[PDB]
Amino acid sequence: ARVAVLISGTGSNLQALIDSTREPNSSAQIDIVISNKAAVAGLDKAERAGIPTRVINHKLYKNRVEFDSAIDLVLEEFSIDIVCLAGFMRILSGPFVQKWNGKMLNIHPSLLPSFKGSNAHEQALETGVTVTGCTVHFVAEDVDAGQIILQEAVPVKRGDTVATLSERVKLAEHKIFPAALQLVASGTVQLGENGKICWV
Ligand SMILES: Nc1nc2sc(CCCc3ccc(C(=O)N[C@@H](CCC(=O)O)C(=O)O)s3)cc2c(=O)[nH]1
Ligand SMILES: NCC(=O)N[C@@H]1O[C@H](COP(=O)([O-])[O-])[C@@H](O)[C@H]1O
Ligand code: NA
C-alpha cells in the first residue's frame, strides 16, 4: 500500500512509521510526506529518509475544501492508498474525509472516547485519571469518533505534566501506529460494510 503521512510538527510518529515501513515484511511504503507548516522538523526527518516532501500552507487557501482539495491533488499525484495523520493539526473537510473513508488513519493521545480534541493531555491531567493512553482510529467525519483500530494504555504518574505524560504516551504511539498501519496495509483490518471495523 502506498502511504502518505501528513504532519504539522516534530515528526516522531512519522519517524516511527518510517522505521517500521523499512522492515522487510512491511506491507506499507511511505511515498510522500505533506506538512501544512514550513521549517517543521518532520520535514527534515522525511528528507533525511529520502522521502519526498510537500508543504501545503492552509493560509494561501480561502476555505478548507480548497485547502484539502490541494492535498488530495498531491495524494492523487503520488497514487496514494492510505493517508496517515501523524501530528497533523488541521480538521479535514467532509468530502475529503468521505472520499478517504476507510483509508485514513489518525493517532490521538488519549484512550478515546475520553479527551477528544487538541489538548488531550491537559484534559487527562485536569481530570485526574491514573491511566491514559493513545488511539489509532479511522478518520470519520466527526472528530476522534471514527472506528478504533488500536489502543495502548499508559500510566499517569504522580506529578506528571504535559511534558512528561506526553513523553511517556509517545512511546506507546510509536508502537501502535506502525502496527495499525501494518494491519490496514495488509488488508487484515478494514472498515466493514456495516461501518464498524472488520478483521480478516
Ligand atoms: N473530520 C476529521 N478531521 C480530522 S483531522 C484529525 C487529526 C486530529 C487533530 C485534531 C484534533 C482536534 C483538532 C482541532 O480542534 N483543531 C483546530 C485547531 C487548528 C490548529 O491549527 O491547531 C482546527 O483545526 O480548527 S485538530 C482528526 C480528524 C477527525 O477525526 N475527523
Ligand atoms: N489531536 C491530535 C494530536 O493531539 N496529535 C498529537 O500530536 C503529537 C505529534 O507528535 P509528532 O509530531 O512527534 O509525531 C502526537 O503526540 C499526537 O498524539
Ligand atoms: Na486527534
Short mmCIF file of C-alpha atoms and ligand atoms in Angstrom, two decimals:
data_model
loop_
_atom_site.label_atom_id
_atom_site.label_comp_id
_atom_site.label_asym_id
_atom_site.label_seq_id
_atom_site.Cartn_x
_atom_site.Cartn_y
_atom_site.Cartn_z
CA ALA A 1 0.00 0.00 0.00
CA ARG A 2 1.25 3.43 -0.96
CA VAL A 3 1.07 5.72 2.09
CA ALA A 4 1.14 9.50 2.59
CA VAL A 5 1.92 10.94 6.03
CA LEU A 6 0.62 14.40 6.97
CA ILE A 7 2.44 16.31 9.73
CA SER A 8 2.41 19.68 11.48
CA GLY A 9 5.46 19.45 13.76
CA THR A 10 8.26 17.34 15.20
CA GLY A 11 7.51 14.13 13.31
CA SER A 12 8.35 11.46 15.91
CA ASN A 13 5.36 9.41 14.79
CA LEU A 14 6.45 9.97 11.20
CA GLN A 15 9.88 8.70 12.19
CA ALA A 16 8.39 5.64 13.90
CA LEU A 17 6.34 4.93 10.75
CA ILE A 18 9.41 5.35 8.53
CA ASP A 19 11.40 2.90 10.68
CA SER A 20 8.66 0.27 10.52
CA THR A 21 7.90 0.52 6.81
CA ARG A 22 11.57 -0.09 6.01
CA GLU A 23 11.15 -3.53 7.62
CA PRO A 24 11.26 -6.35 5.03
CA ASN A 25 7.78 -7.64 5.98
CA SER A 26 6.18 -4.16 5.93
CA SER A 27 3.03 -4.02 3.81
CA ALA A 28 3.29 -0.22 3.59
CA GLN A 29 5.62 2.16 1.79
CA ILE A 30 5.73 5.88 2.60
CA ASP A 31 5.79 7.72 -0.72
CA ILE A 32 5.09 11.33 0.26
CA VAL A 33 5.22 13.49 3.37
CA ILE A 34 2.91 16.53 3.49
CA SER A 35 3.14 19.29 6.12
CA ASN A 36 0.88 22.31 6.50
CA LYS A 37 3.72 24.18 8.28
CA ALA A 38 7.16 25.01 6.92
CA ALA A 39 10.50 24.62 8.72
CA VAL A 40 8.95 21.93 10.95
CA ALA A 41 11.27 19.10 11.92
CA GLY A 42 9.18 16.30 10.39
CA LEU A 43 10.11 17.73 7.00
CA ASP A 44 13.77 17.06 7.81
CA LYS A 45 13.20 13.57 9.19
CA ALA A 46 11.48 12.82 5.88
CA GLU A 47 14.14 14.49 3.74
CA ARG A 48 16.81 12.53 5.64
CA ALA A 49 14.74 9.43 4.84
CA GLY A 50 14.77 10.16 1.12
CA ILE A 51 11.00 10.64 1.15
CA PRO A 52 9.58 13.47 -0.99
CA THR A 53 8.03 16.35 0.93
CA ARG A 54 5.37 18.93 0.06
CA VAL A 55 4.19 21.88 2.15
CA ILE A 56 0.57 22.96 1.70
CA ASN A 57 0.06 26.14 3.74
CA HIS A 58 -3.59 26.29 4.81
CA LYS A 59 -3.26 30.09 4.73
CA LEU A 60 -2.96 30.67 0.98
CA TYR A 61 -6.37 28.94 0.69
CA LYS A 62 -9.61 30.85 1.20
CA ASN A 63 -11.63 27.94 2.60
CA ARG A 64 -10.90 24.48 3.96
CA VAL A 65 -12.16 22.47 0.98
CA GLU A 66 -9.92 24.44 -1.37
CA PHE A 67 -7.08 23.60 1.04
CA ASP A 68 -7.90 19.89 1.31
CA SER A 69 -8.50 19.80 -2.46
CA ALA A 70 -4.88 20.95 -2.66
CA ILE A 71 -3.79 17.96 -0.56
CA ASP A 72 -5.99 15.46 -2.42
CA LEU A 73 -4.30 16.59 -5.63
CA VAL A 74 -0.90 15.57 -4.23
CA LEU A 75 -2.32 12.29 -2.92
CA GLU A 76 -3.56 11.50 -6.43
CA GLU A 77 -0.23 12.54 -7.97
CA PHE A 78 1.58 10.00 -5.76
CA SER A 79 -1.07 7.28 -6.29
CA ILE A 80 -1.53 7.12 -2.51
CA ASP A 81 -3.66 4.37 -0.96
CA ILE A 82 -3.53 5.15 2.78
CA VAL A 83 -3.30 8.54 4.49
CA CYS A 84 -1.66 8.73 7.93
CA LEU A 85 -2.35 11.82 10.06
CA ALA A 86 0.75 11.96 12.30
CA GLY A 87 0.54 15.17 14.32
CA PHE A 88 -1.45 16.89 11.61
CA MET A 89 -3.39 19.62 13.39
CA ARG A 90 -5.95 20.64 10.74
CA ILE A 91 -9.51 19.42 10.62
CA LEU A 92 -10.37 17.88 7.29
CA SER A 93 -13.44 18.80 5.25
CA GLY A 94 -16.37 16.43 4.91
CA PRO A 95 -15.85 15.48 1.26
CA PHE A 96 -12.14 14.88 1.85
CA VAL A 97 -12.94 12.61 4.80
CA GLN A 98 -15.74 10.89 2.88
CA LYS A 99 -13.51 10.30 -0.16
CA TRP A 100 -10.79 8.76 2.02
CA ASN A 101 -13.29 6.96 4.25
CA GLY A 102 -11.75 3.71 5.36
CA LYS A 103 -8.30 4.76 4.07
CA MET A 104 -7.20 7.50 6.54
CA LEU A 105 -5.68 6.79 9.97
CA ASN A 106 -5.19 9.25 12.82
CA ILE A 107 -3.16 8.97 16.05
CA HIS A 108 -4.70 10.70 19.08
CA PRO A 109 -3.01 10.83 22.54
CA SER A 110 -5.88 9.60 24.66
CA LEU A 111 -7.93 6.48 25.17
CA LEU A 112 -10.84 7.64 23.05
CA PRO A 113 -13.62 8.32 23.58
CA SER A 114 -12.01 10.16 26.52
CA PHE A 115 -10.38 13.56 25.98
CA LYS A 116 -11.18 14.38 22.38
CA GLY A 117 -9.70 17.47 20.81
CA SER A 118 -6.36 19.15 20.73
CA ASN A 119 -5.24 19.14 24.39
CA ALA A 120 -5.89 15.56 25.47
CA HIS A 121 -3.02 15.57 27.99
CA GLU A 122 -4.20 18.77 29.65
CA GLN A 123 -7.65 17.24 29.88
CA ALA A 124 -6.34 13.98 31.29
CA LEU A 125 -4.29 15.85 33.93
CA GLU A 126 -7.14 18.24 34.78
CA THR A 127 -9.48 15.26 35.17
CA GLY A 128 -7.13 13.21 37.34
CA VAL A 129 -7.03 9.84 35.59
CA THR A 130 -4.27 7.45 36.63
CA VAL A 131 -4.43 5.66 33.26
CA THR A 132 -4.38 7.37 29.89
CA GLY A 133 -3.04 6.17 26.53
CA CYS A 134 -3.23 6.65 22.79
CA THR A 135 -5.61 5.62 20.00
CA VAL A 136 -5.16 4.89 16.28
CA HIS A 137 -8.54 5.14 14.53
CA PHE A 138 -10.05 5.60 11.08
CA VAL A 139 -10.83 9.24 10.42
CA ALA A 140 -14.60 9.71 10.30
CA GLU A 141 -16.46 12.97 9.78
CA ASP A 142 -16.99 13.64 13.50
CA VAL A 143 -13.55 14.17 15.02
CA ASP A 144 -11.91 11.41 17.09
CA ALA A 145 -15.00 9.23 16.68
CA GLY A 146 -14.10 7.07 13.70
CA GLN A 147 -13.57 3.35 14.09
CA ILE A 148 -10.82 2.43 16.53
CA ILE A 149 -8.02 0.19 15.24
CA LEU A 150 -5.55 0.00 18.17
CA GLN A 151 -5.14 1.48 21.64
CA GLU A 152 -2.43 1.26 24.27
CA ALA A 153 -2.75 2.25 27.93
CA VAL A 154 -0.13 4.48 29.59
CA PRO A 155 0.06 5.13 33.37
CA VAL A 156 -0.20 8.67 34.64
CA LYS A 157 2.43 9.15 37.35
CA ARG A 158 2.07 11.47 40.34
CA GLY A 159 3.48 14.88 39.47
CA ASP A 160 3.12 14.31 35.71
CA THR A 161 2.93 17.31 33.43
CA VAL A 162 2.14 17.62 29.74
CA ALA A 163 5.88 17.36 29.09
CA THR A 164 6.36 14.07 30.97
CA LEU A 165 2.96 12.44 30.27
CA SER A 166 3.23 13.19 26.55
CA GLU A 167 6.80 11.82 26.55
CA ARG A 168 5.55 8.53 28.00
CA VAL A 169 2.49 8.37 25.74
CA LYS A 170 4.53 8.97 22.58
CA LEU A 171 6.41 5.75 23.32
CA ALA A 172 3.12 3.93 23.02
CA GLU A 173 2.13 5.95 19.93
CA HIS A 174 5.33 4.86 18.17
CA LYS A 175 4.28 1.22 18.74
CA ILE A 176 0.58 1.08 17.90
CA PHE A 177 0.77 3.50 14.96
CA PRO A 178 3.18 1.34 12.93
CA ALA A 179 1.16 -1.72 13.96
CA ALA A 180 -2.15 -0.11 12.95
CA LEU A 181 -0.73 0.92 9.59
CA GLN A 182 0.52 -2.60 9.02
CA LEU A 183 -2.91 -4.06 9.90
CA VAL A 184 -4.61 -1.75 7.39
CA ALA A 185 -1.98 -2.07 4.66
CA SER A 186 -2.02 -5.87 4.81
CA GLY A 187 -5.80 -5.97 4.48
CA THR A 188 -6.02 -7.60 7.89
CA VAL A 189 -8.21 -4.74 9.15
CA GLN A 190 -10.70 -2.61 7.22
CA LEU A 191 -13.81 -0.58 7.68
CA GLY A 192 -16.60 -3.09 7.23
CA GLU A 193 -19.66 -2.50 5.07
CA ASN A 194 -21.54 -2.13 8.40
CA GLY A 195 -19.23 0.79 9.25
CA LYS A 196 -17.57 -0.91 12.19
CA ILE A 197 -14.06 -2.31 11.98
CA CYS A 198 -13.55 -5.58 10.12
CA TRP A 199 -10.91 -8.19 10.96
CA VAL A 200 -9.64 -10.73 8.43
N1 LIG B 1 -13.02 15.20 10.15
C1 LIG B 1 -11.95 14.86 10.92
N2 LIG B 1 -10.81 15.58 10.71
C2 LIG B 1 -9.72 15.25 11.48
S1 LIG B 1 -8.48 15.79 11.47
C3 LIG B 1 -7.67 14.87 12.68
C4 LIG B 1 -6.28 14.98 13.19
C5 LIG B 1 -6.55 15.17 14.68
C6 LIG B 1 -6.03 16.54 15.06
C7 LIG B 1 -7.04 17.45 15.70
C8 LIG B 1 -8.00 17.18 16.62
C9 LIG B 1 -8.75 18.26 17.02
C10 LIG B 1 -8.36 19.41 16.38
C11 LIG B 1 -8.84 20.79 16.48
O1 LIG B 1 -9.70 21.12 17.28
N3 LIG B 1 -8.21 21.61 15.61
C12 LIG B 1 -8.39 23.05 15.40
C13 LIG B 1 -7.05 23.74 15.75
C14 LIG B 1 -6.26 24.10 14.49
C15 LIG B 1 -4.75 24.12 14.66
O2 LIG B 1 -4.06 24.60 13.79
O3 LIG B 1 -4.19 23.59 15.76
C16 LIG B 1 -8.76 23.33 13.95
O4 LIG B 1 -8.20 22.78 13.03
O5 LIG B 1 -9.75 24.19 13.67
S2 LIG B 1 -7.03 19.10 15.29
C17 LIG B 1 -8.56 14.01 13.16
C18 LIG B 1 -9.82 14.21 12.44
C19 LIG B 1 -11.10 13.53 12.56
O6 LIG B 1 -11.22 12.62 13.38
N4 LIG B 1 -12.15 13.87 11.79
N1 LIG B 2 -5.39 15.65 18.18
C1 LIG B 2 -4.21 15.10 17.53
C2 LIG B 2 -2.99 15.16 18.42
O1 LIG B 2 -3.06 15.64 19.56
N2 LIG B 2 -1.87 14.67 17.87
C3 LIG B 2 -0.69 14.50 18.67
O2 LIG B 2 0.42 15.31 18.22
C4 LIG B 2 1.69 14.70 18.53
C5 LIG B 2 2.61 14.76 17.32
O3 LIG B 2 3.93 14.32 17.66
P1 LIG B 2 4.99 14.05 16.47
O4 LIG B 2 4.84 15.25 15.56
O5 LIG B 2 6.32 13.98 17.17
O6 LIG B 2 4.53 12.75 15.83
C6 LIG B 2 1.35 13.28 18.96
O7 LIG B 2 1.58 13.13 20.34
C7 LIG B 2 -0.14 13.06 18.65
O8 LIG B 2 -0.82 12.21 19.53
NA NA B 3 -6.89 13.54 17.20
#
